[PDB]
Design a protein around this motif. Structure first.
Motif, PDB file in Angstrom:
ATOM      1  N   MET B  98      -7.642  67.525   4.142  1.00 39.92           N
ATOM      2  CA  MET B  98      -8.635  67.250   3.116  1.00 39.92           C
ATOM      3  C   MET B  98      -8.774  68.487   2.236  1.00 39.92           C
ATOM      4  SD  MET B  98     -11.989  67.281   1.754  1.00 39.92           S
ATOM      5  CE  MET B  98     -12.749  66.098   0.646  1.00 39.92           C
ATOM      6  N   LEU B  99      -8.784  68.241   0.920  1.00 42.35           N
ATOM      7  CA  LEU B  99      -8.643  69.167  -0.209  1.00 42.35           C
ATOM      8  C   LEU B  99      -7.363  70.008  -0.202  1.00 42.35           C
ATOM      9  CD1 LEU B  99      -9.885  72.442   0.467  1.00 42.35           C
ATOM     10  CD2 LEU B  99     -12.033  71.219   0.225  1.00 42.35           C
ATOM     11  N   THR B 100      -6.357  69.640   0.605  1.00 42.10           N
ATOM     12  CA  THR B 100      -4.992  70.108   0.352  1.00 42.10           C
ATOM     13  C   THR B 100      -3.979  68.968   0.267  1.00 42.10           C
ATOM     14  OG1 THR B 100      -4.645  70.512   2.720  1.00 42.10           O
ATOM     15  CG2 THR B 100      -5.323  72.404   1.360  1.00 42.10           C
ATOM     16  N   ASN B 101      -4.087  67.952   1.126  1.00 37.57           N
ATOM     17  CA  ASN B 101      -3.239  66.759   1.062  1.00 37.57           C
ATOM     18  C   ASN B 101      -3.831  65.719   0.131  1.00 37.57           C
ATOM     19  OD1 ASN B 101      -2.324  67.484   4.237  1.00 37.57           O
ATOM     20  ND2 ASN B 101      -0.772  66.467   2.975  1.00 37.57           N
ATOM     21  N   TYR B 102      -4.568  66.177  -0.886  1.00 39.41           N
ATOM     22  CA  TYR B 102      -5.593  65.356  -1.512  1.00 39.41           C
ATOM     23  C   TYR B 102      -5.008  64.200  -2.306  1.00 39.41           C
ATOM     24  CZ  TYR B 102      -9.955  64.118  -3.691  1.00 39.41           C
ATOM     25  OH  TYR B 102     -11.070  63.444  -4.126  1.00 39.41           O
ATOM     26  N   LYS B 103      -3.924  64.422  -3.056  1.00 37.08           N
ATOM     27  CA  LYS B 103      -3.361  63.343  -3.867  1.00 37.08           C
ATOM     28  C   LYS B 103      -2.591  62.334  -3.019  1.00 37.08           C
ATOM     29  CE  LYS B 103      -4.990  64.564  -7.821  1.00 37.08           C
ATOM     30  NZ  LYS B 103      -5.990  63.691  -8.493  1.00 37.08           N
ATOM     31  N   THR B 104      -2.401  62.626  -1.731  1.00 40.22           N
ATOM     32  CA  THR B 104      -2.095  61.586  -0.760  1.00 40.22           C
ATOM     33  C   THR B 104      -3.355  60.876  -0.272  1.00 40.22           C
ATOM     34  OG1 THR B 104      -0.054  62.675  -0.028  1.00 40.22           O
ATOM     35  CG2 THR B 104      -1.110  61.139   1.526  1.00 40.22           C
ATOM     36  N   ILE B 105      -4.405  61.623   0.107  1.00 43.41           N
ATOM     37  CA  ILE B 105      -5.603  60.987   0.657  1.00 43.41           C
ATOM     38  C   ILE B 105      -6.566  60.513  -0.423  1.00 43.41           C
ATOM     39  CG2 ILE B 105      -5.320  62.437   2.678  1.00 43.41           C
ATOM     40  CD1 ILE B 105      -8.542  63.007   0.900  1.00 43.41           C
ATOM     41  N   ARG B 106      -6.275  60.780  -1.704  1.00 47.01           N
ATOM     42  CA  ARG B 106      -7.070  60.213  -2.793  1.00 47.01           C
ATOM     43  C   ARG B 106      -6.976  58.693  -2.803  1.00 47.01           C
ATOM     44  NH1 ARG B 106     -11.439  61.318  -6.066  1.00 47.01           N
ATOM     45  NH2 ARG B 106     -11.271  60.118  -8.008  1.00 47.01           N
ATOM     46  N   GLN B 107      -5.796  58.164  -2.504  1.00 47.85           N
ATOM     47  CA  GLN B 107      -5.583  56.724  -2.415  1.00 47.85           C
ATOM     48  C   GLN B 107      -5.513  56.266  -0.961  1.00 47.85           C
ATOM     49  OE1 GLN B 107      -5.805  54.872  -5.170  1.00 47.85           O
ATOM     50  NE2 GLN B 107      -6.168  56.772  -6.308  1.00 47.85           N
ATOM     51  N   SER B 108      -6.261  56.952  -0.098  1.00 54.15           N
ATOM     52  CA  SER B 108      -6.413  56.528   1.286  1.00 54.15           C
ATOM     53  C   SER B 108      -7.891  56.321   1.572  1.00 54.15           C
ATOM     54  CB  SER B 108      -5.812  57.552   2.247  1.00 54.15           C
ATOM     55  OG  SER B 108      -5.985  57.136   3.590  1.00 54.15           O
ATOM     56  N   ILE B 109      -8.663  56.117   0.501  1.00 55.37           N
ATOM     57  CA  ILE B 109     -10.090  55.840   0.594  1.00 55.37           C
ATOM     58  C   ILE B 109     -10.361  54.340   0.578  1.00 55.37           C
ATOM     59  CG2 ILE B 109     -12.315  56.582  -0.432  1.00 55.37           C
ATOM     60  CD1 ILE B 109     -10.659  58.870   0.455  1.00 55.37           C
ATOM     61  N   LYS B 110      -9.390  53.542   0.149  1.00 53.77           N
ATOM     62  CA  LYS B 110      -9.618  52.162  -0.263  1.00 53.77           C
ATOM     63  C   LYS B 110      -9.029  51.197   0.762  1.00 53.77           C
ATOM     64  CE  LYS B 110     -11.528  53.682  -3.991  1.00 53.77           C
ATOM     65  NZ  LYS B 110     -12.986  53.526  -4.233  1.00 53.77           N
ATOM     66  N   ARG B 111      -9.849  50.798   1.731  1.00 53.48           N
ATOM     67  CA  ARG B 111      -9.605  49.592   2.516  1.00 53.48           C
ATOM     68  C   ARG B 111     -10.660  48.527   2.267  1.00 53.48           C
ATOM     69  NH1 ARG B 111      -8.290  51.872   8.626  1.00 53.48           N
ATOM     70  NH2 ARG B 111      -6.336  52.983   8.193  1.00 53.48           N
ATOM     71  N   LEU B 112     -11.759  48.891   1.603  1.00 51.07           N
ATOM     72  CA  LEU B 112     -12.796  47.951   1.210  1.00 51.07           C
ATOM     73  C   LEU B 112     -12.653  47.476  -0.228  1.00 51.07           C
ATOM     74  CD1 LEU B 112     -16.110  47.609  -0.032  1.00 51.07           C
ATOM     75  CD2 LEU B 112     -15.315  46.440   2.042  1.00 51.07           C
ATOM     76  N   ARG B 113     -12.053  48.280  -1.110  1.00 47.62           N
ATOM     77  CA  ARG B 113     -11.842  47.871  -2.496  1.00 47.62           C
ATOM     78  C   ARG B 113     -10.813  46.749  -2.585  1.00 47.62           C
ATOM     79  NH1 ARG B 113     -10.213  52.202  -7.340  1.00 47.62           N
ATOM     80  NH2 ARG B 113     -10.302  50.740  -9.099  1.00 47.62           N
ATOM     81  N   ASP B 114      -9.886  46.709  -1.631  1.00 42.05           N
ATOM     82  CA  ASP B 114      -8.756  45.782  -1.644  1.00 42.05           C
ATOM     83  C   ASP B 114      -8.980  44.585  -0.733  1.00 42.05           C
ATOM     84  OD1 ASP B 114      -7.495  47.501  -3.424  1.00 42.05           O
ATOM     85  OD2 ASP B 114      -6.554  48.650  -1.810  1.00 42.05           O
ATOM     86  N   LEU B 115     -10.196  44.429  -0.215  1.00 45.71           N
ATOM     87  CA  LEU B 115     -10.519  43.315   0.665  1.00 45.71           C
ATOM     88  C   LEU B 115     -11.894  42.794   0.254  1.00 45.71           C
ATOM     89  CD1 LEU B 115     -11.348  42.051   3.908  1.00 45.71           C
ATOM     90  CD2 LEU B 115      -9.047  41.868   2.942  1.00 45.71           C
ATOM     91  N   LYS B 145     -17.083  58.496   0.021  1.00 44.81           N
ATOM     92  CA  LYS B 145     -16.997  57.387  -0.922  1.00 44.81           C
ATOM     93  C   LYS B 145     -16.947  57.903  -2.353  1.00 44.81           C
ATOM     94  CE  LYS B 145     -17.217  54.179   2.224  1.00 44.81           C
ATOM     95  NZ  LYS B 145     -16.052  53.306   2.515  1.00 44.81           N
ATOM     96  N   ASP B 146     -17.851  58.817  -2.694  1.00 43.61           N
ATOM     97  CA  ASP B 146     -17.825  59.501  -3.977  1.00 43.61           C
ATOM     98  C   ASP B 146     -17.169  60.862  -3.775  1.00 43.61           C
ATOM     99  OD1 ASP B 146     -18.159  60.185  -6.610  1.00 43.61           O
ATOM    100  OD2 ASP B 146     -20.353  60.149  -6.584  1.00 43.61           O
ATOM    101  N   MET B 147     -16.258  61.223  -4.680  1.00 44.44           N
ATOM    102  CA  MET B 147     -15.444  62.418  -4.488  1.00 44.44           C
ATOM    103  C   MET B 147     -15.388  63.320  -5.715  1.00 44.44           C
ATOM    104  SD  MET B 147     -12.400  60.598  -2.343  1.00 44.44           S
ATOM    105  CE  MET B 147     -12.774  59.073  -3.198  1.00 44.44           C
TER     106      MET B 147
END
Lengths: 87, 221, 129
Positions: B98-115, B145-147
């Motif tokens: 977190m805050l180094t792998n961020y542009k990988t984990i930026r799109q690992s927040i969404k399991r509720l947006r897509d369901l 949730k907010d980043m």
RNA sequence: AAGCGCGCGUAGGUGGUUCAGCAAGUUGGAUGUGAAAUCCCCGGGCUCAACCUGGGAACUGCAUCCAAAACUACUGAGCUAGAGUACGGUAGAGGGUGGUGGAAUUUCCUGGAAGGAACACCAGUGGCGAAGGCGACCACCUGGACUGAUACUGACACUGAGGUGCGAAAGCGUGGGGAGCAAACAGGAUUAGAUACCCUGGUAGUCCACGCCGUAAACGAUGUCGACUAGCCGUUGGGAUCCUUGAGAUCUUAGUGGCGCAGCUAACGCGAUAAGUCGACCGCCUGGGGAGUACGGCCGCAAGGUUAAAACUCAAAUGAAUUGACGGGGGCCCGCACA
């Protein structure tokens, strides 16, 4: 070590403002008396070189204490070389 | 705020043992007391007063802060005292990255947006294990949730266990604040806060110093 | 045994510069006291503190910068072995002249700036940088 | 690749501390030179360049001379920190001599008689000694450090090529002993074969007195010495602090260990017992083979040891570490792989 009667005996001519046990009248000639009486145990125990390495350690240090008297006081040096049965 | 009667009340002056201490906290030992080392209680007073000054002069300057209180005994209030604050937070298993792998984990927040069809509906076998894993995100992404992209300030609780989270912070340059006990080093944190984090009631003396101050930075704007 | 008085003080503060200690005390001489007085005038340390008792000692109060302190290294040049008696034309401008290069002369144990504008050379003692 | 196995210490290298003096080293200027050439710049010339010269610059050098006194030597009086001794007290497989032992095992014989040798437990990341080294019990003649202080010395200092002693065991001396094992071997079982591990047997040897060899995986593969820079946990000897009954904490030291930052390191890892920061000195190294070998010297009765080369030959040998593979490497697991 030396005998309890003897180690307090031999200081009685080394006095020179008697509270000195530190001038080289003492660490030569207590230590010269250490040379002259602990010859005994060598004749029985001649297979132990641990005890005469202390002999050569302080007969050098006696000669080291003779070496400082070579320059600091030649006159009281004659009280050492003329006495004690040296050389 | 700064007064002694709640400063002395719960856990603060307690500390780690003479078996367990780093001497870099040797400026912060107020006497040896039954072989455990005491937080220095008189120059504590400028530090956790400056912990409320700096937290409000950028909340009026529009920052947003993260809360790493990642401890099992301390994650309880960290869900509660960081819900009263508007800050993101994580209290259980800081994921290394977190805050180094961020542009990988930026799109690992969404399991509720897509369901947003079936969690409102009930795809029963093939959507249960997706929704049983629906708490696999907010166990570590609980306040994430907010980043807003990248964080701006960072407040830590346990330096001794999560030494990663400060070496996360120094790796960027984000300003570091947090409570330190005599077990770890007060080094890597920018400006120190001496204080215990082993008692449970000693936790929210600063966490309810945050919810007092986090509204007192938003009031300036 | 100990063989050099002032190389024993120039080592004992550098490991204290990378340590977290401030007042360094050791049994000191006039030789170590004449060295300490010139670099407090160069803004490096302060208050050499002759103890003025029997077994006199030096309490050099070294200053800290924020984080890494003010003196990185003190490099001995003239140790006691190869003792670097050097002229006035050949004084070392250590770090572009930002080392002050204290050199023992007759009229003063003195920096290289005043060693050249009043020309006496001699024992180039140590890097102060 | 490289710490002699370590000591005592000769020349020597370097040397705590203060005032004063000297002016040898150190520092400045003065003067003679440091030949000319060459060089270095500015030029002059060959029509241009070499080349040629003019002018200087340069020539870090040498002695003499006066001036200087922070430091070094030297000289003198000192100063107590380094180093030593007068006083016990223990701790201690220090080391040696002589005895007294016990069980096995071994060898006899009707459980006793007989003699060799190492001494289960106490045993310890314990002591002790410069090192090599060293444990039943007992006296007897003897070491060095530690510490508790109290006294005194006034750097007497550390290190040290040569030099000089002292160094595990197989040895071979010069004399003895005698159990087990076992170097030397004979076969037994085994393999193409044992000349091997396994099996049945035994002299030299370890032991003793003097003496010689002076070898090492003498290894902590880390020279001796002092100084200083976060720690934390056991453990050894003193001592003092400690409410004190110690079931003992803390502190203080001199050893012996664990782990770790600062630190260094090629990495492994060291880490106040450094492999850091340093200082004095010493030994040692210069690619791998040839080679620690020839030849010469020295020592030995011999086996040999110590000092120690090139000729040739190869562009690599080596160090730690990582991936893969391999393993008669371990550990789990899977499958009719095992009935």
């Amino acid at each position: 070590a030396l005998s309890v009667e003897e180690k307090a005996q031999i200081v009685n001519e080394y006095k020179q403002a008697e509270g000195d046990t530190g001038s080289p009248e003492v660490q030569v000639a207590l230590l010269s008396a250490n040379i002259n009486k602990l010859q005994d145990h060598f004749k029985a125990n001649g297979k132990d070189h641990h005890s005469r390495r202390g002999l050569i350690r302080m007969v050098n240090q006696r000669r080291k204490l003779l070496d400082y008297l070579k320059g600091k006081d030649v006159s009281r040096y004659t009280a050492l070389i003329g006495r004690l049965g040296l050389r | 705020q700064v007064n002694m009667r709640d400063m002395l009340k719960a856990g603060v002056h307690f500390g780690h043992q003479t078996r367990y201490w780093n001497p870099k906290m040797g400026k912060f030992i107020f006497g040896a007391r039954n072989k455990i080392h005491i937080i220095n209680l008189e120059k504590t007073l400028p530090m956790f007063n400056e912990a409320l000054t700096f937290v409000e002069r950028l909340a009026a300057g529009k920052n947003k802060i993260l809360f790493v209180g990642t401890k099992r005994s301390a994650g309880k209030i960290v869900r509660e005292e960081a819900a009263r604050c508007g800050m993101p937070y994580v209290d259980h298993r800081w994921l290394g990255g977190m805050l180094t792998n961020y542009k990988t984990i930026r799109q690992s927040i969404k399991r509720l947006r897509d369901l947003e069809t079936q969690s409102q509906d009930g795809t029963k076998k093939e959507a249960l294990m997706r929704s049983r894993d629906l708490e696999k995100l907010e166990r570590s992404l609980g306040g994430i949730k907010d980043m807003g992209g990248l964080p701006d300030a960072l407040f830590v609780i346990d330096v001794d266990h999560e030494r990663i989270a400060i070496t996360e912070a120094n790796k960027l340059g984000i300003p570091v604040i947090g409570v330190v006990d005599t077990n770890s080093s007060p080094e890597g944190v920018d400006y120190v806060i001496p204080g215990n984090d082993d008692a449970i009631r000693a936790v929210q003396l600063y966490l309810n110093s945050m919810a007092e101050a986090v509204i007192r930075g938003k009031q300036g704007a | 045994s100990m063989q050099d008085p002032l190389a024993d003080m120039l080592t004992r503060i550098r490991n204290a510069q990378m340590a977290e200690k401030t007042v360094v005390s050791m049994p000191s001489s006039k030789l170590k006291a004449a060295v300490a007085k010139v670099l407090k005038d160069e803004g490096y340390i302060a208050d050499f503190q002759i103890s003025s008792e029997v077994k006199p000692q030096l309490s050099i109060e070294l200053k800290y910068f924020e984080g890494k302190p003010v003196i990185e290294e003190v490099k001995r040049i003239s140790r006691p072995g190869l003792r670097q008696y050097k002229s006035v034309e050949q004084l070392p401008a250590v770090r572009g002249g930002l080392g002050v290069s204290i050199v023992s002369t007759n009229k003063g144990v003195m920096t290289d700036r005043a060693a050249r504008a009043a020309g006496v050379g001699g024992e180039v003692l140590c890097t102060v940088f």
